[PDB]
Design a protein around this nucleic acid. Sequence first.
DNA 1: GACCACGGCGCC
DNA 2: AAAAGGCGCCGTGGTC
Length: 539
Amino acid sequence: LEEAPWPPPEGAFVGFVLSRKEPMWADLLALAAARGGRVHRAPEPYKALRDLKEARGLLAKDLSVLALREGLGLPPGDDPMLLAYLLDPSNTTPEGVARRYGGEWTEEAGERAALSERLFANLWGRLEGEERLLWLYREVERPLSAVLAHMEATGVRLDVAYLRALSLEVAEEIARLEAEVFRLAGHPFNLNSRDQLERVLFDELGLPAIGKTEKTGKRSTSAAVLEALREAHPIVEKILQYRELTKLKSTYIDPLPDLIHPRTGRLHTRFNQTATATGRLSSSDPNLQNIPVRTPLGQRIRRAFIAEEGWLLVALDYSQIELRVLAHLSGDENLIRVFQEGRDIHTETASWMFGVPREAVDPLMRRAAKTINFGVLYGMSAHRLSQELAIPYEEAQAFIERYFQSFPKVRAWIEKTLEEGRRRGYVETLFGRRRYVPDLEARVKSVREAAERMAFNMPVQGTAADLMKLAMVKLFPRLEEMGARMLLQVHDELVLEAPKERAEAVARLAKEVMEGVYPLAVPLEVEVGIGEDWLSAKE
DNA sequence: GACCACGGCGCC
DNA sequence: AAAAGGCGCCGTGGTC
Ligand SMILES: CCN(CC)C(=O)CCC(=O)NCCCN(CCCNC(=O)CCC(=O)N(CC)CC)C(=O)CCC(=O)NCC#Cc1cn([C@H]2C[C@H](O)[C@@H](COP(=O)(O)OP(=O)(O)OP(=O)(O)O)O2)c(=O)[nH]c1=O
Ligand SMILES: [Mg+2]
Ligand SMILES: [Mg+2]
């Protein structure tokens, strides 16, 4: 390409090199743009950012987040990553996409700019005639990248002092547990080492091994195994408590406080847009889509996520979203009727599980019940279910008969979906988002049937993901005009931040946007709460 | 210091 | 652990 002085003409593709992958933390080392057989290299990248109207090219969202961090309103535009991801969601990295569609991902901005231009041309070509994928690109993914950029640069407020204090308290409790574990073993060892624990439980103490690990066939010490052994030796309960506490402390309590950004004073995640097989987003660095919520200590941690002073958090969560999607995709009259009547399948199952009436099902019971509902829907075995519910195998097998019989046209949809996947080599969401599942023709049964479970889960999980993304795209500009903020997405949930005066109006508005995103054969219901912290906001 | 594979486990 | 699916991060163990 012909070397040409900065700045580039408008519509040029950008290339850029960060000192580290996280755009809120990165130094912009270099910046370039490419168009019309030219390549322009910015003498000083930060200053050159101001000359661009739009970030167009590979990882456009990351450069846009960096720009917002610097006070520049630079929105992301076309990104070949989004084109490739729609063509095949195993296209998750620029290294791979480059190799697959016409170049190499190097460490030089000018080369990355040229690459973006070339790859865009080629991938755009491949999407011609693919009208549904085109609609997903233009109406969903592309605008969604702009929304994600704002969410990332905005961040979420965290009560750091609270977490610091919590750490010291959990440390003492952890020591109480580990000391007792060592007393019971008769000697200390690295309790964090599942290999050392394996030998203590199964070789030294006389406990029966229950299961083996997947890759290396060691005797497993997983929570499920320990659960089954909870009454064979008092050390087992202590170990389970130890695991709970150390998991929460090492993953959330200790790391999160150290990740507060000096400029914003908030915590900033990344919402990865080309990272999953089904079309869901993922979150990393840190992952804010797996903040604890179940146990007492977990809830204490979620309480650390708080609203700016003068603001409130608003949490909105789609009700039984994948069951409703299933009703629509399958067209099952019984299931559709359930939602037209306003029934709650999770409460109902929770009612059967704990042997209480529906009004007796508390939040944590209902939670347990959804693991069972989706567990079964997506192929859980009779054997496993009996083990979890701690009931006879015959009771577990029975529950699964009744489950699929109540909703007769589901299996038809599953069989239709699997046959279709075998022929085309891929399955599809409602909107035509694709996932290739070649192992549907595998000759090994365990491999083939695992593939089948992935394949028929995908249209359901993926449609739910399409709906939520579309909702985010419609909702974002409405929040901007009300002076509220979109902060996080957790798959079928959004967390917004609104000024106190407008929080009620924002909650109502967001609820309606989410419910009316794309009407289905059953209503979509959204549960909404308002609060000073994330736990309170989910009520 | 960093990379991986693994087991394990937090959320949806 | 097991015929639920989708993720990312932790510490260990082994390298490099
Ligand atoms: C090989 C087979 N293998 C391997 C593992 C598996 O198949 C893998 C599965 C997996 O990887 N791990 C398994 C589950 C692990 N455990 C717990 C561990 C167990 N230890 C205890 O219980 C201890 C008890 C305890 O301490 N105490 C307190 C001390 C009490 C319990 C959790 O996830 C914990 C967290 C949790 O349950 N959070 C709920 C959940 C969930 C799921 C969601 N979805 C999809 C559809 C939904 O529609 C959509 C939206 O979700 P959501 O909005 O929520 O639901 P709805 O929209 O439908 O309903 P409403 O919005 O109306 O309410 O997402 C799934 O596909 N599967 C799901 O499980
Ligand atoms: Mg939900
Ligand atoms: Mg949810």
